[PDB]
């Protein structure tokens, strides 16, 4: 059907230019009107503007003015998101969504696309198992997981099983550290009697460091 | 420069009854205003257009209205376990301005939880840390207490916890403390417990275990 698929997290100095993409895959019309759109992590949304692929006049929203410009793609129908002049302020989550009201009735968000405006540099996590104890069995039922620690960049995607897995999953938000650092726990609850050789896999990705690791989880 | 509000930093209802939110602002604008929900670490989603409908949306289970200086988004629970938070944007013209917004506070019954305690990796002593984690699985409500104790002594701001956004299905809670210090203070002990004192229990259950079995 429709996608709206845009590209992974990146991380820049402060005084950096980036130009964002987010896909059409489904929608090749030219009548859909994509709109930006910034999330801090601090819960609070803004409207950055819009565009129409026929005489896109929406470039700009009053408070950012000069910060950013958008600009399309004949290729791909990509929309470009041009930002420069970056700063801290700029750090949020951004999205792109479809939606012709007066041709269709539905629409659809893109992944989304996270920016980090600090002095750090890149650093994959480090992933150290959790294996079940005869403790961690509670009325013939154990539990399981890992831990990441230490990645600078926010985005850590935690699969496992390769995406096939979802029951009883338990993703805890990026604590940070004392270190500066975040960290982070993916457990999951499974019974006693997988301990026949019934393997699971933190199948975790960290995509701005490219650091890709499954490890896998056994007792002891 | 049009504004708008929604009044409610916080919501919290229980699990059938309804709920109606309210949203204002500084103009008057009718069959315009939309509405989404941001599902919890999930892209926000289409919940409403000109205070009509949505495509793919409940039958009914949420309703609102209001244009002017007032609106408001009455929800009622009849099949709802949805827990997320929701905005009201002023689509009629720009900047297209949108509002505060209000999390939902799903009450349901107290849950006890379940306890299961972790050692260190192995392949974490390598690096002379210790991370130890002990963990709650699924419970209500949020206030509770943990304590740290290693062959009975005490330990303090040595030790971080993380708690989870709520559950879809069960309005469960799960958190997660993590004690950590040098490989060197975790090898000079043999015993490790974690006390937790949840508003939901009657005595605080300590549980612990030995190193090297």
């Known amino acids: 059907e429709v996608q709206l698929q845009q590209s992974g997290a990146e991380l820049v100095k402060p005084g950096a230019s980036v130009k964002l993409s987010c896909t059409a895959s489904?929608?090749?019309?030219?009548?859909?009107?994509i709109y930006w759109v910034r999330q801090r992590p601090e819960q609070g949304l803004e409207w950055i503007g819009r565009?129409?692929?026929?005489?896109?006049?929406?470039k700009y929203d009053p408070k950012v003015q000069g910060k950013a410009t958008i600009t399309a793609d004949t290729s791909s129908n990509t929309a470009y998101l041009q930002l420069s002049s970056l700063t801290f302020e700029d750090t949020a989550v951004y999205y792109c969504?479809?939606?012709?009201?007066?041709?269709?009735?539905?629409?659809?968000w893109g992944q989304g696309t996270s920016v980090t405006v600090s002095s750090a540099s890149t650093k994959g996590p480090s992933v150290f198992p959790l294996a079940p104890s005869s403790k961690s069995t509670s009325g013939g039922t154990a539990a399981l997981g890992c831990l990441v620690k230490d990645y600078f960049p926010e985005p850590v995607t935690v699969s496992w099983n390769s995406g096939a897995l979802t029951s009883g999953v338990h993703t805890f938000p990026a604590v940070l550290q004392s270190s500066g650092l975040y960290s982070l726990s993916s457990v999951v609850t499974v019974p006693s009697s997988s301990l026949g050789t019934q393997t699971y896999i933190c199948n975790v990705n960290h995509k701005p460091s490219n650091t890709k690791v499954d490890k896998r989880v056994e007792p002891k | 420069d049009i504004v708008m509000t929604q009044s409610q930093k916080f919501m919290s209802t229980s699990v059938g009854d309804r709920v109606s939110v309210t949203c204002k602002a500084s103009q008057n604008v009718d069959t315009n205003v939309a509405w989404y929900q941001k599902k919890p670490g999930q892209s926000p989603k289409a919940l409403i257009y000109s205070a009509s409908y949505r495509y793919s949306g409940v039958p009914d289970r949420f309703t609102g209205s209001g244009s002017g200086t007032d609106f408001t988004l009455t929800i009622s629970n009849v099949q709802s376990e949805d827990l997320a938070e929701y905005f009201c944007?002023?689509?009629?013209?720009?900047?297209?301005?949108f509002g505060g917004g209000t999390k939902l506070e799903i009450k349901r019954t107290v849950a006890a939880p379940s306890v299961f305690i972790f050692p260190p990796s192995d392949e974490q002593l390598k690096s002379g840390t210790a991370s130890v984690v002990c963990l709650l699985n699924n419970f209500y409500p949020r206030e509770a207490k943990v304590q740290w104790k290693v062959d009975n002594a005490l330990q303090s701001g040595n030790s971080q916890e993380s708690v989870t956004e709520q559950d879809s299905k069960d309005s469960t809670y799960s958190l997660s403390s993590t004690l950590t210090l040098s490989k060197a203070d975790y090898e000079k002990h043999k015993v490790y417990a974690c006390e937790v004192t949840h508003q939901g229990l009657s005595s605080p259950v300590t549980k612990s275990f030995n190193r090297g079995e």
């Open positions: 944007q002023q689509y009629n013209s720009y900047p297209y301005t």
């Open positions: 489904g929608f090749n019309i030219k009548d859909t009107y």
């Open positions: 969504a479809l939606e012709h009201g007066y041709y269709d009735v539905m629409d659809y």
């Open positions: 565009i129409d692929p026929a005489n896109g006049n929406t």
